[PDB]
Design a binder for this molecule. Structure first.
Ligand SMILES: [Mg+2]
Lengths: 62, 164
């Protein structure tokens, strides 16, 4: 039944709040997913300023 | 990796897709990410539908990072290696676990290992699919928006289930 919700393109929202060694940050992301092709396209923005860790370290979280 | 419900599960493996089976009510996804010789991230996320939109809401806590190791020292390249997510059922929690290793390229040609341990449990109480052992084959490409001056990341990812 849940699979039925994924047969087309689905909008995605991502919202993260982080604290790494006391550096506080937030990231907002938007995009879409199409599970038929196992395909995801997203753009993330650090809304608090500069990201205090490297972007690649957050990919699996997002 | 935050929205594994968008993996392509081949038709012959569709009885193994936990992630979509928990929807729309969703699942909690928790991880411990251990950076070798450095700190760790602990994450808690809720992945569920809000109307017709799939939402990934996350809290991340990182501790015990070295002020000038590869992470806080920003020594990692802006790229990403393909990897497999190895999934196993957790029948006692009506959910799954996963284990995998991410290799982050360091700007000097070395590698920064990030060990990932993951657990997912459904938010709803309806039946879910508990899978046989298998993996998700993941490919990711990172880029920038030429018109964007804020700090950001553009991500293209493909995720395909396999191993059965
Ligand atoms: Mg190299």
């Amino acid at each position: 039944k849940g699979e039925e919700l994924f047969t087309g393109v689905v909008p995605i929202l991502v919202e993260l709040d982080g604290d790494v060694n006391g550096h506080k940050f937030s990231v907002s992301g938007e995009g879409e997913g199409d599970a038929t092709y196992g395909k995801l396209t997203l753009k993330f923005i650090c809304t608090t300023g500069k990201l205090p860790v490297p972007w690649p370290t957050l990919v699996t979280t997002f | 990796s935050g929205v594994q419900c968008f993996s392509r599960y081949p038709d012959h493996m569709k009885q193994h897709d936990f992630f979509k089976s928990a929807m729309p009510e969703g699942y909690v996804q928790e991880r411990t990410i251990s950076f070798k010789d450095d700190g760790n991230y602990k994450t808690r996320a809720e992945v569920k539908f809000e109307g017709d939109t799939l939402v990934n809401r996350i809290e991340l806590k990182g501790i015990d990072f070295k002020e000038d190791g590869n992470i806080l020292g920003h020594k990692l390249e802006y790229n990403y290696n393909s990897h497999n997510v190895y999934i196993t059922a957790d029948k006692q929690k009506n959910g799954i676990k996963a284990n995998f290793k991410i290799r982050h390229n360091i700007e000097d040609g070395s590698v920064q290992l990030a060990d990932h341990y993951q657990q997912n449990t459904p938010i709803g109480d309806g039946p879910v699919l508990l899978p046989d052992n298998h993996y998700l084959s993941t490919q990711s490409a990172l880029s920038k928006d030429p018109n964007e001056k804020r700090d950001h990341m553009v991500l293209l990812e493909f995720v395909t289930a396999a191993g059965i």
